Design a protein around this ligand. Structure first.
Ligand SMILES: *[C@@H]1O[C@H](CO)[C@@H](O[C@@H]2O[C@H](CO)[C@@H](O)[C@H](O)[C@H]2NC(C)=O)[C@H](O)[C@H]1NC(C)=O
Ligand code: NAG
Ligand code: NAG
Lengths: 597, 192
């Protein structure tokens, strides 16, 4: 028959075996992640070996069905995802060692302990423990001990492993005709579909860098303001024209500045826009947090969570002897099995995260209608952005008041508006440079621009120049500080958190216009607009079936990242910030460090 | 002389869709109250007949077809439908007269580790005519030539269902009984 008819039947074969093998792999991964055991590590590795072996043989077979001779775009797109394999192209010994490296790096990170010098018996994991210090402590020494002790105990172990990791990951990328493993990662944004909807891997770097130029003035001012207000909390440790010490940024990495909110709130006598204390005082639990997020999605027309979700998910650390990996994640295990793994605390951050993860599920639930090869996000940024459209609404004073976390006599003035905008900025603007600078470093390592001998030299040079953050302790090439972040040790690409943040507001601007909202888009609560949920679900249900440039142009007007909605959303905080910084220095000197003092 | 619906509905083993089984009911008294006042049927659609009036009707014979499908395929056991189950496994006629009943069987038919005993046919040359059955197990080729796997473009036509206790509802096993009611110019043998 036609080469199109042969490939349709080939795909139907593929879909039925893959559904089985990827389900067994997902199940085996879930039990490891929910119950870290030697037996479950072996079971995980085996099920993934069967999935990888399958997947690579099907890639080779897919090539015999040449793309040019098929005329149905859906099949043509299903075959394209099958054309480029993964680590199979490596020597069996070679892919043996790389799978070992990834398993060691992941369990070094989740088993690492750093011990108190003053108390050698008290040994702390990252989660919970070191993280509790890095979020709630106000002592320069306590945070420094945790920050440095983390990068020194597990960072130092990961360094020899990370070196082998780039050489092998790059050997796998070049064997697949990519320049390097970074080029391979940027492939996720590659779009060859229709005309005018084309996007190449190399444009992602130009576009990321052009848009980061427009964000930088707002960030410099946010930076100047929090640097001023940390001098009230850390007098004799902050230089008013310098970079900010990296252990004082509110988490283990300064990934989000949200826990600086207490130290930086402008109008603190107003009703607290951080509803963490109101949640505790009303005896909320993790269940309530997830039920409230479910209530939100139902009010916009999206479905409720499945019954299996409530039975199978891990919504708090179990504390029954099992060791868990606590990093919040939303799983589509296949066969309609949707779960969330999260060690949920009673916190506005985890309240917002639970919305973030539920949006992942909601996306996975909608593109279930698509054929197997096509049930993924349009790109990775889309996927991390659906959750954050919900957080944008769920965090508004308005929505908080309707949920009961703000008093019924609560009223919005210009001071609670700056409060809310400043907290949003600590989370969403504070993370852009941190995210940009990390993947720039990663991309440059894989490319060859940074040699092993300068890995930590360039990391702390880029931290200071781009992020305005400085290391509290000198770090030799014996260190490997970026690998102390979960996503790096666990072989995940990071630029999704950058493109997501720009996508966030493009989506939010478009759904609010559908919700017939009037006024600024930071006042907008998408809650109860079924028209808005209808518009969103139309893109969610498309999955990867259309190129992401078209998928974007179908919700919002444009076919590429636009930073204009993000800047409008923060236009009142930005004008306010400029005034608070009218007699202050905006920017940073890279020369000063806490230890050259 | 009560009609033995309990042997069809309460049978231990059910068969796969592609190999569906049929029991002939005749010369009996058919009390459908055992069916229609019961909680467990997620699907209870009648065609050319009213569920509520079942105990007043008389027929020449009634035919009961048993098999198992995914939740998301129960919608294919209905007149006018298409898809793998309706095309290649079990096809109802458009003038169907009878009732389709299904219930969730995850407790009986799904496992922690996965139950692969139930199969369905997903490749066939041409659709099935109504109430036809194909239990042939011959490797399928789109050109239609005889081939032998592992050769290219050559596939086994029966797929296993994979029934796990943790799956979404549309992937959970459902037992299905299709009662056909037959009106012949003969006397009646099944009544209320
Ligand atoms: C966590 O994982 C362990 C190890 O895989 C589980 O233990 C085993 O349980 C199965 C089923 O009961 C037995 O067949 C194995 O022989 C057990 N092996 C060992 C070494 O104990 C344990 O059940 C899991 N715990 C939870 C709560 O899921
Ligand atoms: C959504 O609708 C319910 C029903 O009246 C209402 O109680 C709730 O306050 C609404 N929320 C918003 C944000 O409008
Ligand atoms: C099957 O078994 C149950 C008792 O376990 C009974 O209630 C039911 O009526 C029986 N027959 C049918 C046709 O369901």
């Amino acid at each position: 028959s036609t080469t199109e008819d042969l490939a349709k039947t080939f795909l139907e074969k593929f879909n039925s075996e893959a559904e089985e093998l990827s389900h067994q792999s997902s199940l085996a991964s879930w039990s490891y992640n929910t119950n870290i055991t030697d037996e479950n590590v072996q079971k995980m590795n085996e099920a993934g070996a069967r999935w990888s072996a399958f997947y690579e043989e099907q890639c080779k077979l897919a090539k015999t069905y040449p793309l040019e001779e098929i005329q149905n775009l859906t099949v043509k797109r299903q075959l394209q995802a099958l054309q480029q394999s993964g680590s199979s192209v490596l020597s069996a010994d070679k892919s043996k060692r790389l799978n070992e490296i990834l398993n060691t790096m992941s369990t070094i990170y989740s088993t690492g302990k750093v011990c108190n010098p003053s108390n050698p018996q008290e040994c702390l994991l990252l989660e919970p423990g070191l993280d509790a210090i890095m979020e709630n402590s106000k002592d320069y020494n306590q945070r420094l001990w945790a920050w440095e002790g983390w990068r020194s105990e597990v960072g130092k172990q990961l360094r020899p492993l990370y070196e082998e990791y780039v050489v092998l990951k790059n050997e796998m990328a070049r064997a697949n005709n990519y320049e390097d493993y970074g080029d391979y990662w940027r492939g996720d944004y590659e779009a060859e579909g229709p005309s005018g909807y084309d996007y190449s891997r190399d444009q992602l770097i130009e576009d990321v860098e052009r848009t980061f130029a427009e964000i930088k003035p707002l960030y410099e001012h946010l930076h100047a303001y929090v640097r001023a207000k940390l001098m009230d909390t850390y007098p004799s440790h902050i230089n008013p024209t310098g970079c900010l010490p990296a252990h004082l940024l509110g988490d283990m990495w300064g990934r989000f500045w949200t826990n600086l909110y207490s130290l930086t709130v402008p109008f603190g006598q107003k009703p607290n826009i951080d509803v963490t204390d109101a949640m505790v005082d009303q005896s909320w639990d993790a269940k309530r947090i997830f039920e409230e997020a479910e209530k939100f999605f139902v009010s916009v027309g999206l479905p409720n969570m499945t019954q299996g979700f409530w039975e199978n998910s891990m919504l708090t650390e179990p504390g029954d002897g099992r060791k868990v990996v606590c990093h919040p994640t939303a799983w589509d295990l296949g066969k309609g099995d949707f779960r969330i793994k999260m060690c949920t605390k009673v916190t506005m951050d985890d309240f917002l995260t639970a919305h973030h993860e539920m949006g992942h599920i909601q996306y996975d639930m909608a593109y279930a209608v698509q054929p197997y090869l096509l049930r993924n996000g349009a790109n990775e940024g889309f996927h991390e952005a659906v959750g954050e459209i919900m957080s944008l609404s769920a965090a508004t004073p308005n929505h908080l008041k309707a949920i009961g976390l703000l008093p019924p006599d609560f009223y919005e003035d210009s001071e609670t508006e700056i409060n809310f905008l400043l907290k949003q900025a600590l989370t969403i603007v504070g993370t852009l440079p941190f995210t940009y600078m990390l993947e720039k470093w990663r991309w440059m390592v894989f490319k060859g621009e940074i040699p092993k001998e300068e890995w930590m030299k360039k990391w702390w040079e880029m931290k200071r120049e781009i992020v305005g953050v400085v290391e509290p302790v000198p770090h030799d090439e014996t260190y490997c500080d970026p690998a102390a972040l979960f996503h790096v040790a666990n072989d995940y690409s990071f630029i999704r958190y950058y493109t997501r943040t720009i996508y966030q507001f493009q989506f939010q601007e478009a759904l609010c216009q559908t919700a017939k909202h009037e006024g600024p888009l930071h006042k907008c609560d998408i809650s109860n607009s079924t028209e808005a949920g209808q518009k969103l679900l139309q893109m969610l249900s498309l999955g990867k079936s259309e190129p992401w440039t078209l998928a974007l142009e179908r919700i919002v007007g444009v076919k590429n990242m636009d930073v204009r909605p993000l800047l409008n959303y923060f236009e009142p905080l930005f004008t306010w910030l400029k005034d608070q910084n009218k007699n202050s220095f905006v920017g940073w000197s890279t020369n000063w460090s806490p230890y050259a003092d | 002389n009560l009609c033995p619906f309990g042997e069809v509905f309460n049978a231990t083993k059910f068969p796969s869709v592609y190999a569906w089984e049929r029991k002939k009911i005749s010369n009996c008294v058919a009390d459908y109250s055992v069916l229609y006042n019961s909680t467990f049927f997620s699907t209870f659609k009648c065609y050319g007949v009213s569920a509520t009036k079942l105990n007043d009707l008389c027929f020449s014979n009634v035919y009961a077809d048993s098999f198992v499908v995914k939740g998301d395929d129960v919608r294919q056991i209905a007149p006018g439908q298409t898809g793998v189950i309706a095309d290649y496994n079990y096809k109802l006629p458009d003038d169907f007269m009878g009732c389709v009943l299904a219930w969730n069987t995850r407790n009986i038919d799904a496992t922690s580790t996965g139950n692969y005993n139930y199969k369905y046919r997903y490749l066939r040359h041409g659709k099935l005519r109504p109430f036809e059955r194909d239990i042939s197990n011959v490797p399928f080729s789109p050109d239609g030539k005889p081939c032998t796997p592992p050769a290219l473009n050559c596939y086994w036509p029966l797929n296993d269902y994979g029934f796990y206790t943790t799956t979404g509802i549309g992937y959970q096993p459902y037992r299905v009984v299709v009662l056909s009611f037959e009106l012949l110019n003969a006397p009646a043998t099944v009544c209320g």
